[PDB]
Amino acid sequence: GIVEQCCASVCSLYQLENYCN
Amino acid sequence: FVNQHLCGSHLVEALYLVCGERGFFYTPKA
Ligand code: NA
């Protein structure tokens, strides 16, 4: 989920943009 | 500013800033 990807490990702009509408 | 560990409200604020007017979805339990 985003928490695994961005909090437990380092986030990226690619991952963030994947949750934008 | 997004290439770090972003958790909780810090994550939601990065989403709010990067996504803009497009908005986003925050699903913490995946
Ligand atoms: Na990561």
From Swiss-Prot, chain A:
Q: List the disulfide bonds.
A: 6-11
Instruction: Give the protein's recorded name.
Output: Insulin A chain
Which species is this record about? Bos taurus (Bovine)
Q: What is the lineage of its organism?
A: Eukaryota, Metazoa, Chordata, Craniata, Vertebrata
